[PDB]
Design a protein around this ligand. Structure first.
Ligand SMILES: Nc1ncnc2c1ncn2[C@@H]1O[C@H](COP(=O)(O)OP(=O)(O)OP(O)(O)=S)[C@@H](O)[C@H]1O
Ligand SMILES: Nc1ncnc2c1ncn2[C@@H]1O[C@H](COP(=O)(O)OP(=O)(O)OP(O)(O)=S)[C@@H](O)[C@H]1O
Ligand SMILES: [Mg+2]
Ligand SMILES: [Mg+2]
Lengths: 362, 362
């Protein structure tokens, strides 16, 4: 008779979600307490009732079905670092089309739960797991970069995603990589978040300086990356000097051969972020691994004008021009974050913002 | 009565494949979720239904057969680092020819699944395992090397494979090795992939700087390498200085005696790749271990001409000559990867490619 055993690998989440959502008559429940991010930032705790071992029964269209958890917890391993957490579906039939159907429905509901939000994955051992809960999509119009830099990057990445046949009919690998660099507090990580929210993509964070990251495990992680997901390497310069400086068993050649080597996977987009670009070996930022280097730097006239128009909507452009001129006359280099803080002091008080410029001259 | 116990060693894969393919009436299934690389790069997730413990039955020609998995998971070891994963075939006969027949059929189907693709193996402990899924065979006409370098290597390796009797009638060992060296971004790994795809061979990656690689384990791995497979050592210079610099318990003499020693195996082809050749000890690149050193270097006139003809098919040769002349006049040394990126900017716009050459002068 029909029987299915998920095995707890890159599928467990979706089936748990469906189990909770559809049944509504189940017993042997549990308590999963977590945070929920309501509108207006006022978080509140929330309970999800999820299975616990013993026999659970569900009536979905057609025949009765018996689902179950078989957690005979012998877990001497890091493969889960928790009980093995099997699951079981079964039913008194021998036409296994309906089981395939229910699982695909679970996939559909899972991918539909995140409609206007941004998932963040993370590395658990050598697999990708959800991390926390869906975040709020930071709009892309609220990250003011230099004149004609966000449009360039967005256009290039869109062109990359909507021309896969041009890469195959010439034998090139279907990969790409980007590198944002510049001083501290200038718009790298925020732009990455906004870009991920504009392309309906997700994010997958990867911390090289981590105690459980061998070259083989890294080569396996980037190959099993979720579909339609940006991978991200934050501060890749702090990992190497052509010599490792972190806790772990990762080398330089392993990284260089995992990004672009002989057994690298297709349809992958990697971002890197660094503050200092002189400490990066030229064998890691050459074309093939990193096809677009961009410098997100200190503010200029246009940036300050646009930031002023963002914070105080409903003012004449003359006031914004006055602000930009005064600030850029006062101090030579000023990052957008300092300007953000300065506006954070004067909420809904544009005149006071234009009057108290002299507090920025360090 | 007839009974067989695979023992989970260099055979498990093929029997699992046959179990899935032929039965179609099995129960106690499972869920193996993975990626599938359709045409046009648009990957999609995919499910394979594979066995799970309990009794499975199959009707293959002749007599009924009872197959089974006996996973009584006690796994305190790295020999599998997972449950022991036995398998069992059995049948009410005493003529053990048919079992041999079914296993050979499984081997046939397994070797036939990969028809126009390239397998990549990897090192799991001290055995070779499949890694991911079959890749797409990069054509050899899309890797433009110097004038008469790919033909030379391909001809030498073909002559090696099609004259095994000349090596035995003179007592020489039936081994060979190659070494590609040169600057970064000049065509080493890509050429290795193309060459493996042209000879219907496979690839077996080996990372020396790995935490679980003793000299004995290495001597055992290269002896149990799959049939018709290139072995590959990427960045062999970063492992030694005549002193180890990696995580592991590997030495120099162990490597030198594993490649060519007293207990080295026959019918083996090894590739090495390095950027710096001066840091290699002359006792590792002398003849016997490495019989052909080649320098894949910066571009020249002919390379640029051929690359232009590859990217923009259907243009007059005059335009390609103009491009090559202008680029080689602009900058002294330019690698093929920079040229690839420059063409990646101007898609299907040859005139713009010939006009915007000056953007390469650094
Ligand atoms: N162009 C910009 N427009 C709006 N806010 C910006 C801009 N650039 C930076 N910021 C502000 O910078 C803050 C954080 O930006 P980040 O991208 O994290 O800076 P950063 O480069 O990561 O600095 P480090 O090195 O990580 S401490 C946020 O509060 C943003 O509001
Ligand atoms: N002769 C060539 N023809 C076409 N593409 C080439 C050629 N040489 C290099 N490339 C490009 O180089 C890229 C990677 O080639 P690789 O062989 O990996 O370079 P590499 O020598 O491995 O550099 P490192 O040291 O590993 S960063 C691919 O995108 C190729 O298109
Ligand atoms: Mg940051
Ligand atoms: Mg390489």
């Amino acid at each position: 008779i029909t029987l299915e055993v998920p095995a707890r690998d890159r599928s467990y989440a979706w089936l748990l979600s469906w189990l909770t959502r559809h049944s509504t008559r189940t017993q042997h429940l549990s308590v999963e307490t977590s945070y929920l991010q309501h509108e207006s930032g006022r978080i509140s705790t929330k309970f999800e009732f999820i299975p616990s071992p013993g026999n659970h029964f569900i009536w979905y269209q057609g025949k009765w079905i018996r689902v179950e958890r078989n957690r005979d917890m012998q877990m001497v391993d890091l493969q889960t670092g928790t009980p093995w957490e099997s699951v079981t579906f079964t039913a008194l039939g021998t036409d296994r089309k309906v089981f395939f159907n229910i699982l695909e429905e679970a996939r559909a509901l899972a991918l539909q739960q995140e409609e206007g939000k941004t998932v963040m994955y993370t590395a658990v051992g050598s697999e990708w797991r959800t991390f926390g809960y869906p975040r709020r999509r930071r709009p892309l119009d609220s990250v003011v970069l230099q004149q004609g830099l966000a449009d360039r990057i967005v256009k290039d990445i869109r062109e990359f995603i909507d021309n896969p046949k041009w890469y195959i009919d010439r034998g090139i690998p279907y990969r790409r990589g980007y590198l944002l660099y510049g001083p501290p507090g200038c718009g790298k990580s925020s732009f990455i978040t906004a870009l991920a929210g504009e392309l309906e993509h997700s994010i997958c964070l990867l911390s090289l300086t981590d105690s459980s990251l061998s070259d083989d495990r890294l080569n396996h992680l980037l190959s099993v990356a979720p579909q339609q997901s940006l991978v991200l390497l934050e501060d890749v310069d702090a990992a190497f000097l052509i010599k490792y400086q972190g806790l772990g068993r990762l080398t330089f050649s392993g990284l260089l051969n995992a990004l672009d080597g002989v057994a690298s996977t297709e349809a992958r987009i990697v971002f890197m972020t660094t503050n200092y670009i002189d400490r990066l070996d030229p064998a890691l930022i050459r074309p093939g691994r990193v096809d677009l280097k961009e410098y997100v730097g200190y503010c200029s006239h246009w940036q300050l004008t646009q930031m002023f128009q963002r914070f105080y909507p409903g003012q004449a452009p003359s006031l914004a021009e006055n602000f930009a001129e005064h600030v850029l006359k006062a101090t030579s280099e000023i990052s957008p974050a300092q300007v953000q803080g300065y506006f954070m002091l004067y909420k809904n008080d544009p005149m006071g913002a234009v009057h108290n410029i002299e507090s920025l001259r360090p």
